[PDB]
Design a protein around this ligand. Structure first.
Ligand SMILES: O=C1NCc2ccc(NC(=O)c3nc(C4CC4)ccc3Nc3cncnc3)cc21
Ligand SMILES: [Mg+2]
Ligand SMILES: [Zn+2]
Length: 317
């Protein structure tokens, strides 16, 4: 308690906004994450020395890829922080402890390739894990790190509590497989509209937490336009590299991964907001009304992509 984390005045205020950007200073991101853990969980949730050792080992096992990198891990974590702070009565002690950690760890050792490419490549991980291939790898990496000497950030939990929080983290990381999101949002939509959704039902909590993980994972579409536009360059750098690797295998890539189809990006973005993003934040807002600013920011960026398609805005590449 004696030593507390503090941010400069601008960061202290703006970190509470859903659309906060964590900035270009990598050396500040560990401090920003600890600050969020102290405020959303408590200063006693973890021993600062173990948490600090854990954070630096996680950082080291993210790779130097354009998008699925250490900055994405902390960005996804910050979106979970904003959801938890604005819904603070709804989550348990273990959920607060597990969910920021799950977000930090959710893309561990990502190489910038989709499950589909690992399948077509016949990558060994595809034989180890037939479904949610990369996500089961991310979880396995989380367990490896937690089992390093001095890295057990959950050391004060009983065996049964430790087992629950690892099960929260496992389900949360697996839910970031966007293939699973379509089914989970459909279920949640029907449960909501038929008035059957029950936050005391553990299988219902799992689905709600899954949707929160999708919303956090996609949260780059919920930033102010200048941040959303520049981040779109990072995701497409990975997609186009995968598309190149698909062509090397003699397989035609899907249009969003073909770097020859760069002029069609604004229409593909429009396609993604309508089929995925807007439905995602809409269902989240129905279940957790204080998450409204995510949906509003998503609608604003959708309107910007339409302005691009009408030639009223220009996307520099
Ligand atoms: O269905 C589609 N038809 C065409 C198309 C094109 C692209 C996409 N996907 C994305 O754009 C996207 N995907 C992810 C998840 C890894 C999957 C996360 C963020 C994303 N966008 C984004 C936007 N702005 C700033 N940062 C990131 C889907 C389609
Ligand atoms: Mg992922
Ligand atoms: Zn991710």
């Amino acid at each position: 308690g004696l030593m507390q984390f503090t941010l400069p005045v601008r960061l202290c205020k703006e970190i509470e906004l859903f659309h906060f950007d964590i900035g270009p200073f990598e050396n500040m991101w560990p401090g920003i994450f600890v600050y969020m853990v102290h405020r959303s969980c408590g200063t006693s949730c973890f021993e600062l020395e173990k948490l600090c050792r854990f954070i630096m080992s996680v950082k080291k096992n993210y790779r130097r890829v354009p998008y699925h990198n250490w900055k994405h891990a902390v960005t996804v974590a910050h979106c979970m922080y904003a959801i938890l702070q604005n819904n603070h009565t709804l989550f348990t002690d273990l959920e607060r402890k597990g969910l920021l950690i799950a977000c930090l760890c959710h893309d561990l050792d990502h190489r910038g390739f989709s499950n589909s490419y690992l399948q077509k490549f016949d990558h060994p991980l595809a034989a180890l894990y037939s479904t949610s291939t990369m996500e089961q790898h991310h979880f396995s990496q989380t367990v490896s790190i937690l089992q390093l000497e001095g890295h057990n950030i959950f050391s004060t939990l009983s065996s049964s509590e430790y087992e629950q929080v690892l099960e929260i983290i496992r389900k949360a990381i697996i839910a970031t497989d966007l293939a699973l999101y379509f089914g989970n949002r459909k279920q949640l939509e029907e449960m909501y509209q038929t008035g059957s959704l029950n936050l005391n039902n553990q299988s219902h909590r799992d689905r709600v937490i899954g949707l929160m993980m999708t919303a956090c994972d996609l949260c780059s579409v919920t930033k102010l336009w200048p941040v959303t536009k520049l981040t779109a360059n990072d995701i497409y750098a990975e997609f186009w590299a995968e598309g190149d690797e698909m062509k090397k295998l003699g397989i035609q890539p899907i249009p969003m991964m073909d770097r020859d189809k760069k002029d069609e990006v604004p229409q593909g973005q429009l396609g993604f907001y309508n089929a995925v993003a807007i439905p995602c934040y809409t269902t989240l807002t129905q279940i957790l009304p204080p998450t409204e600013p995510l949906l509003k920011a998503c609608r604003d960026n959708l309107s910007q992509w339409e302005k691009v398609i009408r030639g009223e805005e220009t996307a520099t590449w």
